[PDB]
Amino acid sequence: LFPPQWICCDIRYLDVSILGKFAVVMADPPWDIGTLTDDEMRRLNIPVLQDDGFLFLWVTGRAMELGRECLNLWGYERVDEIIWVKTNQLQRIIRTHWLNHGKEHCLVGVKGNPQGFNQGLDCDVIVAEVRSTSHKPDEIYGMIERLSPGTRKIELFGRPHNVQPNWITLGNQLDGIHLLDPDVVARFKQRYPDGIISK
Amino acid sequence: NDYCQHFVDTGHRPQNFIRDLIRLKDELIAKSNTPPMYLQADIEAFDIRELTPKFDVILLEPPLEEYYRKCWTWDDIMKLEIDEIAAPRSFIFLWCGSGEGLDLGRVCLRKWGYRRCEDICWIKTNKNNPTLDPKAVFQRTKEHCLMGIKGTVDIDLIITEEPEIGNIEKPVEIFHIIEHFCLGRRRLHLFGRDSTIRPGWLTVGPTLTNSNYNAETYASYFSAPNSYLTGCTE
Numbered sequence: 001l002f003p004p005q006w007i008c009c010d011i012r013y014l015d016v017s018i019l020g021k022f023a024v025v026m027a028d029p030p031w032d033i034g035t036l037t038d039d040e041m042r043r044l045n046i047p048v049l050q051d052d053g054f055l056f057l058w059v060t061g062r063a064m065e066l067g068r069e070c071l072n073l074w075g076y077e078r079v080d081e082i083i084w085v086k087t088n089q090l091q092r093i094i095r096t097h098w099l100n101h102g103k104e105h106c107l108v109g110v111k112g113n114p115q116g117f118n119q120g121l122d123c124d125v126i127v128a129e130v131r132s133t134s135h136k137p138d139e140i141y142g143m144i145e146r147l148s149p150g151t152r153k154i155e156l157f158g159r160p161h162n163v164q165p166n167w168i169t170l171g172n173q174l175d176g177i178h179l180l181d182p183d184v185v186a187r188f189k190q191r192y193p194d195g196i197i198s199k
Numbered sequence: 200n201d202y203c204q205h206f207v208d209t210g211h212r213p214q215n216f217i218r219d220l221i222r223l224k225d226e227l228i229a230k231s232n233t234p235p236m237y238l239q240a241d242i243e244a245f246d247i248r249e250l251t252p253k254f255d256v257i258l259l260e261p262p263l264e265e266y267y268r269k270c271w272t273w274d275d276i277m278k279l280e281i282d283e284i285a286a287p288r289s290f291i292f293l294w295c296g297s298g299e300g301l302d303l304g305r306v307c308l309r310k311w312g313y314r315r316c317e318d319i320c321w322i323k324t325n326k327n328n329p330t331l332d333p334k335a336v337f338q339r340t341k342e343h344c345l346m347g348i349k350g351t352v353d354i355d356l357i358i359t360e361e362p363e364i365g366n367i368e369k370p371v372e373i374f375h376i377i378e379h380f381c382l383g384r385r386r387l388h389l390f391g392r393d394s395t396i397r398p399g400w401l402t403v404g405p406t407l408t409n410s411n412y413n414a415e416t417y418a419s420y421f422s423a424p425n426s427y428l429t430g431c432t433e
């Protein structure tokens with residue numbers, strides 16, 4: 001079911017096996033640099049979410065190393081690394097421990113052998129205006145769509161502005177639950193017949 | 200405007216559209232710079248321990264196969280005894296390319312005892328000319344230089360035009376970032392070339408056509424009272 005879907009929940013406690021498999025997984029975790037500890041990050045059940053496809057993992061500070069650990073622990077090889085150069089409304093780098101930071105990093109991991117992906121269409125540098133705090137640029141959805149058109153995708157730790165067609169967005173600041181894919185709605189009812197996601 | 204869509208449409212990399220006091224510091228650096236020193240040496244067959252004294256800054260620029268499209272593999276780079284020529288407090292800048300080096304370069308930094316404080320990234324524009332690794336998902340338009348610290352004004356971006364094919368030179372801007380940190384005056388550039396020789400720096404590399412390095416002459420520059428100068432000092 002093509003239109004935006006989402007689940008308000010705590011990604012630590014949701015039974016993500018009800019969601020199926022995804023061609024692309026994207027994630028913008030609250031690394032401890034409301035955060036999640038390194039073992040909580042390590043323990044997330046990313047491995048069940050895909051058989052073949054790509055993981056896009058935003059990282060910063062020591063998460064550049066830690067996210068490489070999770071990415072390998074979850075079963076991925078890191079094959080690329082996107083750099084978002086943060087500009088203002090006039091295309092100047094905004095700046096802002098040893099060097100000011102002009103950019104944020106997004107690790108690209110492969111799992112399995114994904115086929116039919118349009119590798120090569122975009123390049124590994126995004127130039128896009130900064131917005132709210134920790135708000136990533138919408139350009140990433142275009143590149144991901146051009147890479148894997150029409151396939152189902154999952155975002156972790158999204159806010160409402162992250163909801164996107166062909167995606168299922170998970171976060172604890174989403175307005176409730178909104179599921180349309182019938183296969184998911186089925187498995188969600190069975191696993192959550194009263195609608196509460198705890199433990 | 201979506202520059203990623205623009206690039207797909209036109210071949211103009213998003214970085215093409217990025218737009219846009221310290222001289223006294225630059226002059227202080229230039230005064231306290233040691234004479235340039237340099238030494239031809241095959242670093243594979245070379246006991247780097249012969250390189251003394253111990254260094255405050257190490258710039259490391261091994262010739263990676265990906266730069267050409269003797270190369271060094273990350274296997275060969277991981278085996279360098281960098282920890283034996285670094286001072287207890289010291290810094291490293293390691294050119295890692297844009298592929299597996301981004302992961303193997305980190306292992307190296309830990310291998311030699313550093314932790315990564317900064318990820319300096321060289322973004323290459325293609326304004327003058329609007330190729331793929333098999334494992335690659337996207338077109339590679341940047342290179343990474345990882346900064347490591349061990350022991351107790353500038354930005355982390357360098358933007359220049361993509362050099363000619365077969366030009367393996369890295370942007371001389373990295374030297375300004377390094378020297379503006381004021382990290383010490385013993386600076387070693389491993390795998391430098393004739394074209395990278397530079398005051399304030401000792402260059403060791405297999406292609407250098409001449410050498411002037413002398414271990415005792417070099418240490419003469421740092422004997423007291425000059426032991427602990429930052430390099431930004433009178």
Ligand SMILES: Nc1ncnc2c1ncn2[C@@H]1O[C@H](CN(CC[C@H](N)C(=O)O)C(=O)Nc2ncnc3nc[nH]c23)[C@@H](O)[C@H]1O
Nearest residue numbers: 009010011012028030133134135136157158159171172173
């Ligand atoms: N176990 C958990 N389970 C489910 N959701 C969780 C959670 N744990 C935290 N979340 C939620 O993940 C989302 C993280 N986002 C939205 C990020 C999104 N990529 C964007 O582009 O905007 C975010 O902006 N985080 C922030 N990081 C630092 N400084 C900030 N200042 C204000 N927000 C800040 C939040 O909604 C959070 O409640």
